[PDB]
Amino acid sequence: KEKINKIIMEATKGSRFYGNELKKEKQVNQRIENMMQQKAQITSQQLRKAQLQVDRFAMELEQSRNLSNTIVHIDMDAFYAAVEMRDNPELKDKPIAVGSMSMLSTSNYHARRFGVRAAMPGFIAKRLCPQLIIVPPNFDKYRAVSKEVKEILADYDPNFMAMSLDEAYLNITKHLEERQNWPEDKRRYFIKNSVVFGTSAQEVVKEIRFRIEQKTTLTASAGIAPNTMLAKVCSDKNKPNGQYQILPNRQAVMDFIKDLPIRKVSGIGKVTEKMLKALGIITCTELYQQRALLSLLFSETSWHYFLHISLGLGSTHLTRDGERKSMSVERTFSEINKAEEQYSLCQELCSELAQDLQKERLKGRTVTIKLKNVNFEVKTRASTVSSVVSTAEEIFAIAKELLKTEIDADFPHPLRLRLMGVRISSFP
DNA sequence: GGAAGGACCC
DNA sequence: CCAGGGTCCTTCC
Ligand SMILES: Cc1cn([C@H]2C[C@H](O)[C@@H](COP(=O)(O)OP(=O)(O)OP(=O)(O)O)O2)c(=O)[nH]c1=O
Ligand SMILES: [Mg+2]
Known part of the structure; x- marks a missing residue:
């Protein structure tokens, strides 16, 4: 029932969230605008010359399927939920979810019948399912x-x-x-038996x-x-x-990939789904047909991606367990606008980051602070030294400064933070 | 190689 | 009155 899509939209209406969410969307339609406009400036020649490119490439891709x-x-x-249910009979036949009032990581399946879902705010989930038990x-x-x-x-x-x-x-x-x-x-x-x-x-x-x-x-x-x-x-x-x-x-692949919502594929987000839907693409068959236009509108890396999906191609060799490219810590909180305090909330983050970093005895050389307005607007300043950080003071060194610079950048205004975080990267 | 901003995954 | 951990992909010096 869309009584769900109502209770949600309703409990979101005036929130500063829906606020930034609108600004976000307005910027996507612009990216799209910059596309249709970019498209129109393409001639049949370019286009056909393209069909030749893609068709060949695809021909190769196809020989190595x-x-x-x-x-x-x-x-x-329902992993987290399922696990929490297993460890605690109490939740046996009740609807649950794992998170907080501000965010659910998942909801067992019973809770799902009520519209509750992963990544849905807790307070809303409680709106759709008052009987919802929320486990941390x-x-x-x-x-x-x-x-x-x-x-x-x-x-x-x-x-x-x-x-x-x-x-x-x-x-x-x-x-x-x-x-x-x-x-x-x-x-x-x-x-x-x-x-x-x-x-x-x-x-x-x-x-x-x-x-x-x-x-x-x-x-x-x-x-x-x-x-x-x-x-x-x-x-x-x-x-x-x-x-x-x-x-x-190959027919089996084909019969599946045909009519398959492009969005069900792993990598196609809510954003590129909207961009491709603009071009008139909804399924994989539609996506294939457009292999021409796509080579002219997207990064060699993107349409390369798009081509494999349209043809049902993908990894067949499971690569070795890669390495950790970074490690962070970030917290959300009821607004903190006092500078003295922000430097403290930071000392903490850095200290934590430092210990989770010791568990893997890792040492990187680039620290990035991350700040989030009370309007969800998000800044993010990096800074790379050449000594290789590690300790809590060491990190909090780069960080403290990184932060100071953004406070000052607001001259008399204090940063109205709702979120702050620290990420160390660039390891050996 | 960096630094900023984003899209996407769980 | 909308999280937090991570990875990868442009875009400019
Ligand atoms: C999506 C999503 C998942 N997760 C967590 C919750 C899930 O227990 C776990 C697995 O991701 P998912 O597989 O998508 O969630 P799920 O397995 O619990 O439900 P399903 O039966 O549909 O597969 O990761 C998040 O923390 N945040 C998220 O935004
Ligand atoms: Mg799962």
């Missing part, structure tokens, strides 16, 4: 359950690659090979999920596909405790 790997994307269901996050409790599950996964692909605590990719192609020759008792599990799983990628995933539930009590969903991109889209097709596969042939 790898369909040998059986990638699997696994996604825990407990990440360590999550990393835990996440390690517990990563254990079950190592079995099918010791080199899996975790995207976030509740998601992961798996190249079960090798497992499937050895599994074709596995005695039924090597795929028989006892429930806690029981069950035995087949040899299909369909079945191994069916097993992987089974194990995960049996072990942590939480259900998960999975997508089975020829490559990364398709898999993550599939893991949501039946999302609550289900799975969906896309067979290893």
Whole structure:
């Protein structure tokens, strides 16, 4: 019921939030304006000469469409909520969510029927579901359950690659090979007369999920596909405790990618969705048809991206676990406009940043402060030394200054902060 | 390589 | 009266 989309829009109307949200949107239509206008200044010649480019490239892309790997994307269901429910029977049959009055990280599925969703403000969620119990996050409790599950996964692909605590990719192609020759008792599990799983990628995933539930009590969903991109889209097709596969042939990819909302693809945000919708693009088939216009309107990197999606292409090799490019700490709070205090709230952030930094014994050389007006407007000043910071005082050194400069930049005006934060980056 | 501003993911 | 952790992509010296 859109009584939801009303209670929300209603409880947002005058907020300084909707305020900046409007300014945000006005700036997107401008980016779009600068596009349609940019478009109009294109001639059939340029355009056709382009169709030639893209069509060739695509022709190559197409010759190297790898369909040998059986990638699997696994996604825990309502992770934080689910976990908090498991640790506390009290919440058993009640609707919950994990967050604060100002922000929910998720809502179990019962709460979802009421319109409550992740990233929705708490006070609003309480508007749609007064009976909503809101549990504070407990990440360590999550990393835990996440390690517990990563254990079950190592079995099918010791080199899996975790995207976030509740998601992961798996190249079960090798497992499937050895599994074709596995005695039924090597795929028989006892429930806690029981069950035995087949040899299909369909079945191994069916097993992987089974194990995960049996072990942590939480259900998960999975997508089975020829490559990364398709898999993550599939893991949501039946999302609550289900799975969906896309067979290893090109038509299968095609039949799925056809009519598939461009926005369901990972990387296409609410913003580029609106820009492509401007050009008349909603699905992947529409997106493909426009492979010409796109090469003239977007970065080589973007339309390159756009082309793979339109053709159902994507990673097929799970790269090694990269490295940490940065580490930050930031807090929101009831307005703080007093300078003495802001220098204090900062000392804290720096001190915290310093300790989470010691846990990984990391040392970077670039510190960025981050400030957010009472109007959500956001500044962000960097500063890179050449000695390699580490300690709390060291960081708070660059930071303190970085901050001073922005206070002064307001000469007699005090910075009306709602948010402040610190990020150290540039490690070895 | 930096410094600013953003889009997107969870 | 709208979070917080991270990564990657332009845009200017
Ligand atoms: C989206 C989103 C997720 N998360 C957290 C909440 C989730 O427990 C966790 C996983 O992301 P999601 O997978 O998108 O959330 P979910 O798994 O709980 O729900 P679903 O069953 O639809 O997959 O990360 C955030 O903290 N902030 C966010 O903005
Ligand atoms: Mg999930």
